[PDB]
Amino acid sequence: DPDDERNAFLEVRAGTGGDEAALFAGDLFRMYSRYAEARRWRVEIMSASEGEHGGYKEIIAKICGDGVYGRLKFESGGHRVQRVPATESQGRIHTSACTVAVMPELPDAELPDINPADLRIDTFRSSGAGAQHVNTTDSAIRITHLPTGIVVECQDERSQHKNKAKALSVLGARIHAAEMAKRQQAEASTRRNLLGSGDRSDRNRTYNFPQGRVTDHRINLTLYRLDEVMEGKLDMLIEPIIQEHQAD
RNA sequence: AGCCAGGAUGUUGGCUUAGAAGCAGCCAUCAUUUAAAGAAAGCGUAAUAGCUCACUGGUCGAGUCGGCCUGCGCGGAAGA
RNA sequence: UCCUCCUAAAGAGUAACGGAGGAGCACGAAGGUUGGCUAAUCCUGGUCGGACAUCAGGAGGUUAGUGCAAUGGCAUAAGCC
RNA sequence: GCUCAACGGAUAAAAGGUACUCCGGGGAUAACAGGCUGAUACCGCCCAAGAGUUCAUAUCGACGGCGGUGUUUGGCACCUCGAUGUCGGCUCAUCACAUCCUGGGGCUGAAGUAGGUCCCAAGGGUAUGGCUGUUCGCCAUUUAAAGUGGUACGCGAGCUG
RNA sequence: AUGUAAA
RNA sequence: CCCGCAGAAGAAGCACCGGCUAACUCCGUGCCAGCAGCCGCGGUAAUACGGAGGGUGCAAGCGUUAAUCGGAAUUACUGGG
RNA sequence: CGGCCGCAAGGUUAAAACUCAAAUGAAUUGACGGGGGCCCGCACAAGCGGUGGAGCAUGUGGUUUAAUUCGAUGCAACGCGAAGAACCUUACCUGGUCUUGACAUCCACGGAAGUUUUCAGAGAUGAGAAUGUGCCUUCGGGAACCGUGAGACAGGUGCUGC
RNA sequence: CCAGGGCUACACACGUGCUACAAUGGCGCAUACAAAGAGAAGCGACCUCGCGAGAGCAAGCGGACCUCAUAAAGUGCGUCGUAGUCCGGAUUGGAGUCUGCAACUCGACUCCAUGAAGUCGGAAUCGCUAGUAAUCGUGGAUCAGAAUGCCACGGUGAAUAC
RNA sequence: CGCUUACCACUUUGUGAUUCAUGACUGGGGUGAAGUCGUAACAAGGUAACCGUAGGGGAACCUGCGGUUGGAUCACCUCCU
RNA sequence: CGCGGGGUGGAGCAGCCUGGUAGCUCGUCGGGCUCAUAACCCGAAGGUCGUCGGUUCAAAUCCGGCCCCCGCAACCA
């Protein structure tokens, strides 16, 4: 698919046990960087908020190329961790969780034409005071944009043109703000659906370090490695999910 | 210029095998029978089929078809 | 306030809140005379040395320079020692 | 001895407000309007990629261009400063069609109704309330329609303020 | 100063 | 209500099994599915979830839910500080 | 919230909804005190010679690769397991092979075991040629060795020191 | 199971040791003093050759006799005059020797030639109270060959503890 | 019988009390194996704590005044009864 | 384009006025101190002063030209 061949945004965020989960989020950045350098992908750190004892709390990173999103679709969700940590003086198995969002490109086709043939321009007389000027005048412009319903009212100066330029700048600013607000709501409504609450619930993937097991909740794989997984080579987990996803 | 005629057999052609087949787009834009036919300019079909023009015959039988230079005009040219 | 090109219609002159820019200095020498010389920019070769330091050769011709922003002029040099 | 730089230099020596103002004047010079033009605005046309299951031309139409009107903002000050009262509202209207409806027709991407676009046609009609002083606009409900403009953005020797 | 969670 | 016909012929389920409180193992997941009146289990050796076997309890009823009293002397007059 | 008092701040009386199976008081034993008293250790004081500045040797973390085998990873890991990685060791990887097997036992059949030598292949192996043919005779068999076939199994330096 | 590669890779950091940065020191000659050990598919006298690592021949010893095995710092004498220098020895090239089937990744040793950083070390940190620190040499386990590591022995040998 | 008066239901008007839902916004309360900042209380908790009151500060809180030990130390001063 | 402020480690400022020297702070990396983090200490990198030309014995500086960032870019009757 055309969308597939697209690049991606990876957003790795810490959940339960934010001290430990930052350490696992840094290692997941290491996981997907070792998976990305194996197939020659470009990794750029756009934003990374550090933790306390190492790692990172939130990582937003662009990966560009030819086919990142179509090859990393099934990574949005949770990751449980059973591990014996280093920030402990007791030596007990603790569980943490990390949440990973995978966003597509969605390339910015911004600034549509203002369409003055579709703009309704009403140049009528002004309210306010101080001059006859006002009386013989007009000097007040209201411009309505029909397919959105945005009205711009300007009664600033004595002349229409110097108010025409202000009215068109306010039209451009309000249309750009209303489009970018819808785009940021469309980002957030998908990020709230992909990223859950961040709790220790089962969300499609596990990481069982003392057992030596990787057991996902979809396509029940039982790979007993944790050494060909921690250094790239994530083909055996991602490929059969794609195999039984193409059947639907 | 009008008028009864013709305006073919493989071309379901190889093409991305779901089909583009004279006429979406590719390129090739063959060759025979030949009074004549472009492997096609348009209409119409999922594609066909079909309908015209290209061109060639015949009745017909005198002038006709398309460009350049200008003069005077036509329309665009609708107010309180 | 003053200087330089156009505007400005081939003598002089000529206006606009016209189009481009500068000056309110400097010089005991950069002035006078005499004597002598011709650059800029490229090419080749050469120790540091490299596009550009200096040297030798060749092209080139006053596009260089004339203290200063511009015009005219300059080898008989007004340029350089 | 003067950046007396307002630089042919009124004093050696000087900033502001007047809507409390006042006088001699000016259309030599502005505001409101009338006048000339039409950069702008509105409308019409030429070319044509393209949108439209095909298909520029049912309806649109980029990139470009040519015209009409004097309805908006504009430009110049030709008339007015020994006086032309301007906005909005009430009453009273008049005219042009670049027609909102009614009427007669053509195309349609018009099965009928309901439609889109275009031509002729000004004979008649062309809202009611809230807000805002507001023209205008939004809302609520009708209507067949809630037309655009000119007439000193009509009308104060007709009326408020 | 601080060192969150699974006897 | 009594007599006769025929043939074991037509007639057994429900809850619980860690403690309170009567009764034990195996398999399947794996702080997930889930149970639970309280303490609470399940984080790959579960007498606590699901299934099987076995047992326990009650019986044409068995569990859950709702209400009253007792235990609760945790409304104390009997019978508290 | 309501009533009353007060100039105010506010005071007095005084609930309900909802959550939890704890909250509390006394006292015992350990832990700790930047609490006190006492005592000890190169613990502090005094000095000696070092490390950290340089090169080499080794190990680890990290990076890369086919693996850079695995464990140890605060004192109590880091010239540690390893009292010694060219092959061997090797548990890792690439390539080629074997599967009741390289190693332990049972059944049936066949063959002294062994030695020398040659061909192809990286070699394991595959294909051969000679020689030797005993220790007890139920002599259809033995006590070892070797090859074939089937099942029991063997094997694992694979995981769990929770 | 076999052949090869890897465990020795390298932009970086740390731990532990050796050699140093020199004149109580380097070089050359002469010379004195040890203990503890190991040895047979081993130690390997003596003689000869090679500048050399070692090679050829070949006694003794499974051992208080035989071998490894000349102990070094220490002493005398000569030189070097405080310079990155006659200190230090990394790295590199050539020719080599031992072992092993094979020394290229990836062993040890010797010669020639080159001969860097380093001129006493930042924050900070370690061990020691005696034959101890510090310095110097030797042997063994591992092992066909392969340590500065480990174990063990000996020579000189302080200072401080109020 | 009819009329008229007195009692009088349904209903209407005016003004209050009480109660139930709803109401933009705002305050405090309770829960949440992870979020940000500070370490205020438990040792003399590193400024002893607690209570009442007034003020201040992002916040545990701080400051002043009054009360209480539901607080440690009292072989470091010197000299002692 | 016209006017103004400028271009100094990765970043913010001194230092330009008034010439003789590249400086400070935050930040990055690495090592210590702690069982670990924070704090603290030490060391290293980093800019030639946006660029070019001229005066000067000497331009981070004085002046001019070019490039880049930000702000003001026609209004009050």
Describe this structure in words.
Peptide chain release factor 1 directs the termination of translation in response to the peptide chain termination codons UAG and UAA. The modification N5-methylglutamine is found at residue 132. This protein has four helices and nine strands; from the N terminus they run βαβββββαββαβα. It is α+β, with helices and mostly antiparallel strands. Strands 2-3-1-5-4-9 form a six-stranded mixed sheet, with helices on one face. Strands 6-7-8 form a three-stranded antiparallel sheet, with helices on one face. Strand 7 (141-145) and strand 8 form a beta hairpin. It binds nine RNA strands through residues 14-21, 52-54, 57, 82, 84-97, 121-127, 130-140, 142, 144, 151, 153, 157-162, 164, 198-202, 208, 210-213, 215, 217, 224.
Structure characteristics:
part of a larger assembly; 1 chains; 248 residues; alpha+beta; 6-stranded mixed sheet; 3-stranded antiparallel sheet; 28% helix; RNA-binding; translation release factor activity, codon specific; cytoplasm; ribosome binding
SSE blueprint:
Elements: E1 8-14, H1 18-38, E2 42-50, E3 56-64, E4 77-83, E5 94-103, E6 119-123, H2 132-136, E7 141-145, E8 150-154, H3 161-194, E9 206-208, H4 235-243
Parallel strand pairs: 4-9
Antiparallel strand pairs: 1-3, 1-5, 2-3, 4-5, 6-7, 7-8
This protein binds 9 RNA strands through α1, β5, β6, α2 and α3.
Note the beta-strand portion. Answer: 15-25%
Radius of gyration: 27 Å
Question: What is the topology, as strand order, of the major beta sheet?
Answer: 2-3-1-5-4-9
Largest sheet: 6 strands, mixed
| Alpha carbon gap, first and last residue | 15 Å
Please give the count of helices.
4
Order of helices and strands: EHEEEEEHEEHEH
Structural class: alpha+beta
Helix content percent band: 25-40%
Shape: elongated
Please tally the β strands and state the result: 9
